[PDB]
Structure 1
Amino acid sequence: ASLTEIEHLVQSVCKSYRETCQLRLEDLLRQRSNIFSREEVTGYQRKSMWEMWERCAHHLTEAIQYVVEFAKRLSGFMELCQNDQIVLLKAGAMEVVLVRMCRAYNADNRTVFFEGKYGGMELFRALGCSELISSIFDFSHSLSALHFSEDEIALYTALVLINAHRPGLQEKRKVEQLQYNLELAFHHHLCKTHRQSILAKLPPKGKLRSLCSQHVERLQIFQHLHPIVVQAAFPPLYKELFSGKILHRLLQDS
């Protein structure tokens, strides 16, 4: 691939992300003063564990649906075989969400945009997974220190998804070629914008993998306590990705 092709890939990736970003960045910023009162925080802490898990699983499922659309609009993704499309989304969708979440994180007060207002870590105490929540808040805090532009988030999350090392890929070489083109696009954009210094500050890949593992572990603990809640009230796309059909139809329906 030549230079003009790399720059066209940069614009293509940034456009696909803008169309699928779900929450507009300026909308997230304009709401930073809108914070839950102590009474509203107490209301969240008084909710039952299973109610809070269901609500968070619903919110996560909705965000994942936008990551699926990002993948479908991503250059070269729909060219891969269906097995590899599903392998990449199963391993990478949650990792993309984890990176995207930093846009709704306010590092000044350590609050996140959740259900219409900003609140701190204590909002989620009823989940009974404080270590996982604290890890996600720290991860978003680390990403916030990099001051990602929207274009940088686009290119970085494309690479999080297009990972040729995922186990189960049938056409590993094809994914390797697409990953390399995306890496050139990412690094070309950082060089042109004088932002190559962020490369050494990006999180290790085992970090994203560690957070997803924690998520699956806490889910299996909750599912053991409330199996009927998961069966009856968790989104089916959520169960397909994280518990132990939907992705196929999302990819086919376009």
Structure 2
Amino acid sequence: TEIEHLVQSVCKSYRETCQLRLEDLLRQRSNIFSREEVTGYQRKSMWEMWERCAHHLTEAIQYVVEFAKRLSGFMELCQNDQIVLLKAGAMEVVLVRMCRAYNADNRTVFFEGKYGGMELFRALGCSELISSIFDFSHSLSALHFSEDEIALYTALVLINAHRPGLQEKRKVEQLQYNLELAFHHHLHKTHRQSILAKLPPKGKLRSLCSQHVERLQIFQHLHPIVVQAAFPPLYKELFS
């Protein structure tokens, strides 16, 4: 029941931090930006779209930090290792969480209260990155990832004892092994082990996140946003 308790704990942390309810995202699928509304977004300054998107991504990261803080044993890791794991993994989790807000039927994402295609983001002038994020979301949406699958998979995106610069690798390994057992137990109970072969390959999430954060750092150098900093030790690693 330790592993059953861990599944319950991880799913509760996820529910408390997931931002939007799945049934709300699903109900809103017929609420699509009009041609007029899309043109309104396209005419916005690159720098206004950056401010909006940077705000949304900052809030998304903060919810992921709250998710990690509520994972059994995470707060018992040394601060160095908590920061190493969050710096490496929190934006990877944001990118995975996006698949819930993605509709593969019409290739739209839930953004500021309605669904829109990647054309909504034209003003940012990084069509290749936006295309890559949509493609990644399309790949995960095809799995029909359940809420518990997202919760347990994203716990494992964070709790990775291979991250360079960990000081207590054995302690991270112990948490990782328990979360791997929780995920694999849960897939067996729900007859969903078939998704293991279909999950993103080794390096796909890492390289997408590298490209994404590189672009956020370029925008932040050119046009810095003001962050409502909730996690000073982590903020200090990302901002300068």
Please say if residues 57 and 238 of structure 1, whose CA atoms lie closer than 8 Å, have aligned partners that are also in contact: no
1:1-53: CA deviation from partner (whole Å, max 9, x where unpaired): xxx22122111111111111111111111111111111111111111111111
In structure 2, how many angstroms separate the alpha carbons of the residues matched to 1:37 and 1:195? 38
Most deviating of 136-145 and 17-26: 17-26
Report the Cα offset of residue 219 of structure 1. 2.9
In structure 2, how many angstroms separate the alpha carbons of the residues matched to 1:38 and 1:234? 40
Please say if residues 99 and 157 of structure 1, whose CA atoms lie closer than 8 Å, have aligned partners that are also in contact: yes
TM-score, structure 1 length as denominator?
A: 0.87
Q: Which runs of 5+ in 2 are unaligned?
A: none
- Partner residue, 2:46: 49
In structure 2, how many angstroms separate the alpha carbons of the residues matched to 1:232 and 1:85? 17
Please say if residues 87 and 234 of structure 2, whose CA atoms lie closer than 8 Å, have aligned partners that are also in contact: no
Most deviating of 216-225 and 186-195: 216-225
SS of structure 1 residue aligned to 2:83? helix
Report the Cα offset of residue 228 of structure 1. 8.7
In structure 2, how many angstroms separate the alpha carbons of the residues matched to 1:9 and 1:188? 11
1:152-211: CA deviation from partner (whole Å, max 9, x where unpaired): 111001000101111111101110111011001100110111111100110023111111
Q: 1:236 to 1:77 in 2, by over 3 A?
A: closer
**Percent of aligned positions that are identical:** 100
Q: Which runs of 5+ in 1 are unaligned?
A: 243-253
1:122-159: CA deviation from partner (whole Å, max 9, x where unpaired): 00011111111000001000000001111111100100
- Partner residue, 1:127: 124
Report the Cα offset of residue 220 of structure 1. 4.1
SS of structure 2 residue aligned to 1:112? strand
Q: How many residues align?
A: 240
In structure 1, how many angstroms separate the alpha carbons of the residues matched to 2:4 and 2:171? 21
Cα-Cα RMSD: 3.2
SS of structure 2 residue aligned to 1:215? helix
TM-score, structure 2 length as denominator?
A: 0.92
In structure 2, how many angstroms separate the alpha carbons of the residues matched to 1:87 and 1:38? 43
In structure 2, how many angstroms separate the alpha carbons of the residues matched to 1:191 and 1:115? 37
Q: Say whether residues 1:71 and 2:68 are aligned partners.
A: yes
Q: 1:148 to 1:49 in 2, by over 3 A?
A: same
In structure 2, how many angstroms separate the alpha carbons of the residues matched to 1:187 and 1:179? 12
Report the Cα offset of residue 226 of structure 1. 3.9
SS of structure 2 residue aligned to 1:229? coil
Please say if residues 58 and 235 of structure 1, whose CA atoms lie closer than 8 Å, have aligned partners that are also in contact: no
In structure 2, how many angstroms separate the alpha carbons of the residues matched to 1:197 and 1:169? 32
Q: 1:233 to 1:13 in 2, by over 3 A?
A: closer
Please say if residues 86 and 234 of structure 2, whose CA atoms lie closer than 8 Å, have aligned partners that are also in contact: no
Please say if residues 20 and 66 of structure 1, whose CA atoms lie closer than 8 Å, have aligned partners that are also in contact: yes
